[PDB]
Amino acid sequence: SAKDERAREILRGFKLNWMNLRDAETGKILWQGTEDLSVPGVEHEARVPKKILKCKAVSRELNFSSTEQMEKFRLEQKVYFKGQCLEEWFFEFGFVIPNSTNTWQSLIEAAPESQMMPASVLTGNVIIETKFFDDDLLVSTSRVRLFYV
Numbered sequence: 512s513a514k515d516e517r518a519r520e521i522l523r524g525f526k527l528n529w530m531n532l533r534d535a536e537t538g539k540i541l542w543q544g545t546e547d548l549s550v551p552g553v554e555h556e557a558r559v560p561k562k563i564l565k566c567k568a569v570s571r572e573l574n575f576s577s578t579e580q581m582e583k584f585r586l587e588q589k590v591y592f593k594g595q596c597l598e599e600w601f602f603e604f605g606f607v608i609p610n611s612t613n614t615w616q617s618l619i620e621a622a623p624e625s626q627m628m629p630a631s632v633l634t635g636n637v638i639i640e641t642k643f644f645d646d647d648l649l650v651s652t653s654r655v656r657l658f659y660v
């Protein structure tokens with residue numbers, strides 16, 4: 512369909528340049544990466560400080576480029592523990608100018624009434640699956656395996 516072709520074109524022109532994650536309370540950068548974690552069909556790996564699990568809120572700064580215009584750029588993200596979804600997040604960026612480079616800031620909060628398992632239990636058993644959309648059009652699905660160090 513025209514929609515499937517369009518999703519492939521957006522993926523072709525898309526790149527995640529860098530990303531960092533901060534403790535939202537202190538503003539200190541806990542993790543930073545320049546690997547494009549959005550690339551589909553390969554399991555990405557990331558080693559993060561185990562103390563990030565104790566942050567109630569984590570602030571993300573995601574820098575991306577897009578050759579293609581997007582009307583409603585957004586993400587759906589699920590955290591899986593041994594294949595079971597523990598949590599889901601939705602974030603909306605909106606309009607993307609064709610051939611632009613943008614920095615997107617998000618606040619990722621803990622789900623209320625939930626207790627974090629120890630880092631030693633979680634390490635290597637957590638997969639964060641991210642779906643990139645333009646409105647209801649799925650552009651890509653990528654996965655990151657987490658190690659808490």
Ligand SMILES: c1ccc(Cn2c(-c3ccc(OC[C@H](C4CCNCC4)n4c(-c5ccccc5)nc5ccccc54)cc3)nc3ccccc32)cc1
Nearest residue numbers: 548557559563564566567568569590619620621639641655
């Ligand atoms: C590094 C980290 C994560 C990614 C994946 N990734 C993200 C993303 C970032 C932070 C996220 O935070 C989710 C939680 C926080 C929530 C607030 N309280 C502390 C725990 N979290 C868990 C956790 C929650 C619940 C249960 C078990 C574990 N493991 C964590 C490990 C690190 C930080 C927070 C972690 C959720 C999604 N954006 C992306 C955009 C594009 C591509 C990939 C992207 C990539 C690299």
